[PDB]
Design a protein around this ligand. Structure first.
Ligand SMILES: *[C@@](O)(CO)[C@H](C[C@@H]1CCNC1=O)NC(=O)[C@H](CC(C)C)NC(=O)c1cc2c(OC)cccc2[nH]1
Ligand SMILES: *[C@@](O)(CO)[C@H](C[C@@H]1CCNC1=O)NC(=O)[C@H](CC(C)C)NC(=O)c1cc2c(OC)cccc2[nH]1
Lengths: 303, 305
């Protein structure tokens, strides 16, 4: 029993992080087989980063312009290309610690583990959720560009995120491993705003089931609601609408606890209209939305 | 920027996790050089665990009754001994992935990363604080015993926790790597209850220095206090008393902000006595007590290992 924000063990990714330096600019890269992936803005100078014509800057670079260090060893770049915002540095040595891996694009509301690195050295690991406005609430300082987010299924690492930027509001943005940004952001040195953030409703409900499995029931009530009447109220509070697919994904948690999904929606509607009266749920004073149904099932199955 | 509960990268520990079985009883162990460390109750049957005599139960066992597996590879056991509630099993292969390491016994309030494991396979990692009642608010399922907690300093892994028990209330209890429980618990299949918990004062202060560093400082008052007066007041709110070590580890954050520890204590004292007054700190109206001063430093300064 217990419920905690939990990340995947990150050893398989640790063995892939390297340092990439071009000029006076240094960040992290991801070394898989004989390719090192890193944010392309590493080729920029301070003045370039203001409005980088990346294809122009890139053609003017040579392989020897790129210093790639893996621990003590320096890797020799034998080629360089660009895939959207991701620089691909070819090296003469394949990483022997390359796990089975895949590149995937995560959807909003889904979670992943982030391995935060500095100068190519892993510094910490934590779980994040892709917000509906395609930002993430991470913990990233100068030099963390090139850090990657990932899930693991069996022995296969699914890479979904590479970090590029911190918005003025302090949330974070980045790309998939094909170099496409999540959201409407751009890798230039400008202050950028995200769209209006909404709350991930299916995740809040999963976390309410988790609280019940762990003995917290004070927010429960006898009422039920229709799906549409629930969504009318949820939208009013800037919650995403709950789809029938979401209802279905919650099935296992409904079964385990014996609380129908539409019953638990009536509790959430009461919480949104009434607040929490200074009470807490799983130790939190706010309604937590960064836990997926599957995050809950995998920690609370059998409890 | 941003502030999260962050674990240490756990690769160096994953390469050390193994499975230990005796009869049908299975749990996790820690493979360092040519020794495997694990909870001694692996030698119990389900019925033995009700009222075990571990000395008696161990006299019955030989090296060849112990199944130790790294993945599906068996490590032959060539010696065995018991130290408090930990079993040590000598094996015929020195772990080639052994990191630089040490065994440490941490204080209440200290945090550590937990590598949750099942059948010798790491499954998740998360951060925990040792509560003042010597429990941890963990997330542990059946088969998790022998999971370890650790910190990483430079390249050295400091092991501080081995998992043994879930209490009725849903919190967790265990030992250090020398087999000595944190708290008044015993490894026996019985419902045991922990003392009343308290708030970790040194960590709340750390979190307040964090807020100041970030420009959020409305709560700073013009008062100061003695350490003894603060301790006596803090206890009336269920806050833990500060030690000299606590004052000393707050030193860096005190110098960084220019706010003396006892001045921050007088500010915290006011927050306790008058409440928050509809205001928040770092986004929260709840005072946070599971970040140590090193966590605050490590996260606001990006230290690596
Ligand atoms: C990478 O380390 C750069 O290599 C760095 C990410 C962070 C810096 C602090 N916390 C982080 O996560 N990323 C940047 O510095 C990016 C670089 C771009 C993509 C070329 N820049 C920003 O994130 C950024 C720029 C600006 C800005 O300008 C003007 C104004 C306001 C906010 C802002 N964020
Ligand atoms: C280990 O995996 C045992 O090998 C297991 C830890 C958990 C089980 C569920 N979640 C966990 O973290 N530990 C136990 O099962 C221990 C075994 C002891 C050390 C012999 N027992 C308990 O944790 C336990 C027993 C009882 C109990 O009795 C009856 C009554 C109430 C609570 C309780 N917890």
């Amino acid at each position: 029993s217990g419920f905690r924000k939990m990340a995947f063990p990150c050893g398989k990714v640790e063995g892939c992080m390297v340092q990439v330096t071009c000029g006076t600019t240094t960040l992290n890269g991801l070394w898989l087989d004989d390719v090192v992936y890193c944010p392309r803005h590493v080729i920029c100078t301070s003045e370039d980063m203001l409005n980088p014509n990346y294809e122009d800057l890139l053609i003017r670079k040579s392989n020897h312009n790129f210093l790639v260090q893996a621990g003590n060893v320096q890797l020799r770049v034998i080629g360089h290309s660009m895939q959207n915002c991701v620089l691909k540095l070819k090296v003469d040595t394949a990483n022997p610690k390359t796990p089975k891996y895949k590149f995937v694009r995560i959807q909003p509301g889904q979670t992943f583990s982030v391995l935060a690195c500095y100068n190519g050295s892993p510094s910490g690991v934590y779980q994040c959720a892709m917000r509906p406005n395609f930002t993430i609430k991470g913990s990233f300082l100068n030099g963390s560009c090139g850090s990657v987010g990932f899930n693991i299924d069996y022995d296969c690492v699914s890479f979904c995120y590479m970090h590029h930027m911190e918005l003025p509001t302090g949330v974070h943005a980045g790309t998939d491993l094909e170099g496409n940004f999540y959201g409407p952001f751009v890798d230039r040195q400008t202050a950028q705003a995200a769209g209006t953030d909404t709350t991930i409703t299916v995740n809040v409900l999963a976390w309410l089931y988790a609280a019940v499995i762990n003995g917290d029931r004070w927010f429960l009530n006898r009422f039920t609601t229709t799906l549409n009447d629930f969504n009318l109220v949820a939208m009013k509070y800037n919650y995403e609408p709950l789809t029938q697919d979401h209802v279905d994904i919650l099935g296992p948690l409904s079964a385990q606890t014996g609380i129908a999904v539409l019953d638990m929606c009536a509790s959430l509607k009461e919480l949104l209209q009434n607040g929490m009266n200074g009470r807490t749920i799983l130790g939190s004073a706010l309604l937590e939305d960064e836990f997926t149904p599957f995050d809950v099932v995998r920690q609370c199955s059998g409890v």
